[PDB]
From a paper:
The Stalk is 5-fold symmetrical and is made of [name]/[name] and [name]/[name], with [name]/[name] embedded into the IM and hypothesised to serve as a platform for pilus subunit recruitment and assembly. Indeed, [name]/[name] features two key sites: a VirB2-binding site at its base in the IM, and a pilus-assembly site at its top. [name]/[name] is located at the tip of the stalk, and is expected to be recruited at the pilus tip during the early step of pilus biogenesis. In these regions of the T4SS structure, improved resolution resulted in better-defined densities at the tip of [name]/[name]. In the [name]/[name] N-terminal tip, 11 residues could be added at the N-terminus (residues Gln23-Ala33). Gln23 is the very N-terminal residue in the protein after signal sequence cleavage. Middle panel, this newly built region is hydrophobic in nature. Viewed from the top, the hydrophobic tip of [name]/[name] resembles a needle (insets of each panel).
Author numbering:
A (entry chain C): 116 to 172
B (entry chain D): 59 to 229
C (entry chain E): 173 to 229
D (entry chain E): 59 to 115
The structure:
Amino acid sequence: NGSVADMRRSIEERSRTAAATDKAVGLRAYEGAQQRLAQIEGLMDEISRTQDQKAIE
Amino acid sequence: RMYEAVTGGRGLGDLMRNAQLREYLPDDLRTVYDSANGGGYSGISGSINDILRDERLNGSVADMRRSIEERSRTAAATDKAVGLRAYEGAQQRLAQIEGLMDEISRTQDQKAIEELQARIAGEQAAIQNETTKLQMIAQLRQAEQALISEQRRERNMRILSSGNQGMPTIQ
Amino acid sequence: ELQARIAGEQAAIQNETTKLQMIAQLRQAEQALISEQRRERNMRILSSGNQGMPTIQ
Amino acid sequence: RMYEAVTGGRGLGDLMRNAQLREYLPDDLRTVYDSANGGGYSGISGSINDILRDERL
């Protein structure tokens, strides 16, 4: 809606924002993945100390 | 004693559960593309503003051209190199899995095989994490190509802008 | 033991999934490199630094 | 004997854990595309320079 110039500005803004949003989502997700790795390593550290059968199950 | 060893609660679970790792992905996808202006997603919001600031070209148009060509070539090479090194890591991962199955044959007691099962489960979790990381790398690759295209179009708009006022002078 | 064997088998299929992702990324990179080579050839033909032209004789 | 067979720690876990396979993927993705010049990701940086050298016609 609106004048064709407003349409142009809206479309260019959408394009730039879409590219930037893609990049930012990827970056933050990768940080989360690296923290997720740390958590898995911690769970394997817990495995070394398990004593009873109920604990390991 | 053995009944106590089998029954009861041991507290595992509620173990490393407060780490809110769901906050590193968007809560809802309706507003994921409205995050830059505010609202939507705030972890990306700041990042988006920084990225958009850094993607604006400066200097002469020739410098813009050289920067864009360098970005394109470097992006292709980076994609290839990341793929190659990741594949080497995947082969080493296969060797590790085979080793864990070698350990499966020598297991003797029940506790030993249960620990080995949980170790293999953790190994699967690690491979899951690598799968997620590869997905994230692919998304970043796509975003980088889009950004290079945006820079190209910014340069094109700057050359052909109707706000330009200059022309050659007859002297 | 059979459960742990099947778990290892799942880990192997996970590894193949990661390998396929890596192959797809490499495919994309190869296509990008071919495009880059095409554009290098195009730039070399149309370069403004060229100084030659046919001679009248 | 059977109680000893069920309970205790067996050392599995801390088994093949020093293999740093996370080093074959980028640590952070902000600097993944600055790796060629130096910094970013050192492991791909040697590979990127070789690839860019080999892709010149």
